[PDB]
């Protein structure tokens, strides 16, 4: 995977040069954002189950997916949705902490599109659930720190589009 | 009745009307009884697909 620091290091290493002033400035920017990132990550870890709870409540509950014959019917499948949403939240928190959305590509979006297409999982419904997760987490961690979480959840949604 | 109409039963005593329309047949559901509006159960609607 990659983060802000690894991104800067790889950017320097592709041309083989050492770290100049611009790279150190980018690293300083990431270190400055680090406190906010750690705060948001700890809060989201503490309230992970809740966030998916209200996201499901305000995005999917009492709908065709949950009704009998729906893809979210059959309680095993409901637990599968809960686990998948938790996976999305955890890996979005990973991306927020790292500062780079490469872990999502190489650990979440890798084959997820094919998985859902083969499994009949409603992609738009999942996207709406992730958007609800974004709103809940933004309200939970504020507008600024919530901005990064929204960015990475939006990256997940766009990749899943 | 003019000069061209045969007479017909125009009015009834309440007792006679009761005899006509108070038997088990011919008695309307709503005459002297509370008509509870039947409705499908809400849980049945919720679980209905
Ligand atoms: C009272 C009997 C208890 C109780 C029940 C309760 N359930 C919900 C909401 C849901 N229940 C289900 C359950 C299932 N879906 C399935 O596919 C299966 C297989 C048969 C089951 C068992 C689901 C999916 C939901 C939510 C989605 C939907 O309803 O469409 C509620 C409402 C909770 C809420 O916040 O809406 C309640 C009250 N709750 C209790 O406290 C009692 C013990």
From Swiss-Prot, chain A:
It is a peripheral membrane protein. It is found in: Cellular thylakoid membrane. One of its GO terms (biological process) is photosynthesis. (2R,3E)-phycocyanobilin binds at residue 81. Its main location: membrane. Contains one covalently linked phycocyanobilin chromophore. Coiled coil: none annotated. Heterodimer of an alpha and a beta chain. Light-harvesting photosynthetic bile pigment-protein from the phycobiliprotein complex. Allophycocyanin has a maximum absorption at approximately 650 nanometers. This is Allophycocyanin beta chain. It comes from Synechocystis sp. (strain ATCC 27184 / PCC 6803 / Kazusa). The gene is apcB.
Swiss-Prot record, chain B:
It comes from the Bacteria. It is found in: Cellular thylakoid membrane. Contains one covalently linked bilin chromophore. This protein autochromophorylates. Heterodimer of ApcF (a variant beta-allophycocyanin). Phycobilisomes of this organism are composed of a two cylinder core, from which six rods radiate. The core is mainly composed of allophycocyanin alpha and beta chains and of minor components. This protein is postulated to act both as terminal energy acceptor (by its phycobilin-like domains) and as a linker polypeptide (by its repeats and arms) that stabilizes the phycobilisome core architecture. Has intrinsic bilin lyase activity. Belongs to the phycobilisome linker protein family. This is Phycobiliprotein ApcE. The lineage of its organism: Bacteria, Bacillati, Cyanobacteriota, Cyanophyceae, Synechococcales. The chain holds residues 649 to 697 of 896 of the full protein.
């Amino acid at each position: 995977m990659q983060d802000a620091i690894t991104a800067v290091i790889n950017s320097a290493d592709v041309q083989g040069k050492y770290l100049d002033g611009a790279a150190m400035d980018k690293l300083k920017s990431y270190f400055a954002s680090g406190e906010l990132r750690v705060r948001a990550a700890s809060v989201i870890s503490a309230n992970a189950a809740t966030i998916v709870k209200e996201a499901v409540a305000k995005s999917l509950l009492y709908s065709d997916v949950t009704r009998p014959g729906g893809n979210m019917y059959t309680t095993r499948r409901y637990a599968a949705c809960i686990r998948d949403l938790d996976y999305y939240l955890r890996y979005a928190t990973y991306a927020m902490l790292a500062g780079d959305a490469s872990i999502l590509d190489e650990r979440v979006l890798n084959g997820l599109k094919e998985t859902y297409n083969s499994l009949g999982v409603p992609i738009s419904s999942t996207v709406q659930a992730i958007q609800a997760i974004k709103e809940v987490t933004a309200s939970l961690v504020g507008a600024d720190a919530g901005k990064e979480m929204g960015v990475y959840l939006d990256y997940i949604c766009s990749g899943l589009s | 009745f003019g000069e061209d109409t045969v007479p017909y039963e125009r009015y009834l005593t309440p007792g006679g009307l009761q005899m006509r329309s108070a038997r088990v047949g011919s008695l309307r559901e709503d005459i002297g009884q509370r008509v509870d509006k039947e409705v499908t159960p809400r849980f049945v609607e919720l679980g209905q697909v």
